[model samples]
Target chain A: MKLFYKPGACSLASHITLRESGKDFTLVSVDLMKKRLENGDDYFSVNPKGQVPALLLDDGTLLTEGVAIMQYLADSVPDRQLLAPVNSISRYKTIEWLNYIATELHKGFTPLFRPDTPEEYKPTVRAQLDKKLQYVNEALKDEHWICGQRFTIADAYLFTVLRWAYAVKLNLEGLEHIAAFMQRMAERPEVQDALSAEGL
Target chain B: MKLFYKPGACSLASHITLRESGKDFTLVSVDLMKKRLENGDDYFSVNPKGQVPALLLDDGTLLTEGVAIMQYLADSVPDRQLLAPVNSISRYKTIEWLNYIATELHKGFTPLFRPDTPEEYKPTVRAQLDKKLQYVNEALKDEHWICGQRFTIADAYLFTVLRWAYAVKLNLEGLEHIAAFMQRMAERPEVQDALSAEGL
Candidate 1:
């Protein structure tokens, strides 16, 4: 198995899970600006979506989308509990967070990154992102991870997105739980290795 | 189990699944405009997000989020095959579709439904949505359902979102596969029952 990744992208979440699962795989760095893999092949041939975090299965099937990639890595080593127990209610709850993060929080922050977006839209998008972040902060009030106690793949993904707060200029000074969560995730050997691989 | 829903919302997907699963559950209607459920209780108290498709578990744990509620129904009734096999890689792949539908297709169409959205933003959002809809249309090219050959929860969710095209005046005239899929979903006895129960 091989994962095509760009440094500091959400692909880092998949990288962490693959490492934590002890899955033997090669990482192929894709230079986003050059739009080519380290081998100088057009990245579009790998994923027409031209997104990072594209996983090439051993059978050569290309899997796109970050949440899916993380889930695949977790299930590859189910005993690791990278995700919640299979078919458990908690598992669905974790997926709920994943979906919310992808749509509401992650995409909500995307507009600010776009140079072509009209200046007027940035504040509204930022405000929406902040509102979603507030929900995350409140949800973590009594729980450790999004779905109770387990450090599921959802956490890795959330940590990756929250790390973007700084780049997008969304403040995190008082989001203590989220801050702690980020710090804890950074301490993981697997995540550390993934970050290092990303040249962070 | 009880489902709190508003007609034609994402919650309709869960309602359809519950009926198909042959689960014994009560249907409670919420007047979303008034923010009140049938029992005269505060809807926001049950779900802080104030969203439709909040499922109250038999044990009284409230589950919010459409993807989460759908998966809960699937896990609770494995014999129905609303999801793929629990531990199968195919299951995660199915969920990949579910997450994609919720995050990309569902939310991408949300802004257009809101009456207060800026006029300038509509064309951009609509364009993005049409692009995504085309991707989904292609994904369904050789498969009967999103997960291929299985009427999983992912199909339920897609059916729910496709219904929005009519409400938003976005025509699906040329999308033959999606048109057929929508018609097939509508013809289900469980789907019929759900629509009737919701007074649609």
Candidate 2:
């Protein structure tokens, strides 16, 4: 498999999961700003969406969307327990966190990243992010991972988005659980390797 | 089972899926602005994140997130095939659409729904949505459903968010495919029942 990614983007979640699942894959970096690959190919020709984190399977099929990519990777290596098995309620519970992180935390940062976002409206965005992060903080208050004690793909995705909190200087003050969770994720060799590979 | 929802909200996706799946379930309405149930109970008590489309199982387990809820409902009745089975590649492809609709189409509408959103920022949001909807329109040009042929949970979600285009009045001008897709969805008795149940 070839995983297309931009450093530290939401794609990092799938990159981390790839390593965690012990999958063999090559990384192809894309210059999102230029929408071109390292070889100067038009990225749109590869994925019409012009987005990163698209996975190219051996048969030449491509999968977009980090949530789907992460689940596909995890489900492929079920014994690794990166995600729970089908017919397990825990599976959907973990997915609940994945969807939450996707919509609430990940998408919340889009406007803040866009150059044209009005400066006056940023605080409202920041304030809303802080509020949502508070809920994440509360959910993590007594759990080792977002879904519970076991590490799942949800944790990787959450770790990826939470990093943006610090990057954009969102006020994470008093979010002790989130802070600790980040530290814990950083300690994992898989996560560290993913971050290092991305030059972060 | 019981589903907590807001009328014509994203929850309608799950509501439509429940009816389509031939499942037994009850609906509990939530007033999102006030964050309370019709019975005057605290909404946060049922779901700390306080979002709708939360499904309460017969065993008293609560499943939040429309993506997760719809998947759980579909997976329960495999014969209905609201979602593809675990081993099927079509499964993740369906999920790709679900995540796309969630992050891009659904979350894209958040700013316009918020009263405090700056007047200047509304156009940017609308334009971005228009661009994304064009992609949806292009994708649906030759297909009856978002994932093609079969009507999966992704259709329910795509239908749910696309309705907002009309509500918020995003220029749907020449997106003929999307217009037909909306008409196709509205023709479904399950969709009609779900819409009427929510008084939409």
Question: Which candidate's TM-score is highest?
Answer: 2
RMSD values for the candidates in order, in angstroms, are: 2.1, 1.1
Worst 10 residues of 2 chain A by lDDT: A78-87
The share of true interface contacts that also appear in candidate 1 amounts to 0.55
C-alpha RMSD in Å of predicted model 1 compared with the true structure:
2.1
Position B22, candidate 2: lDDT: 94
lDDT tens digits, residue span B8-101, model 1: 8889999988888888998888888778887798888898877788889888888878888887778778877887765577777777788778
Best-matching candidate per lDDT: 2
- Residue B173, model 1, lDDT: 64
Candidate 1: give the TM-score of chain A: 0.94
lDDT of 2 at A192: 99
Can you give the TM-score per candidate against the true fold?
Answer: 0.93, 0.98
What local lDDT score does residue B185 receive in model 1, on the 0 to 100 scale?
A: 81
What TM-score does prediction 1 earn?
0.93
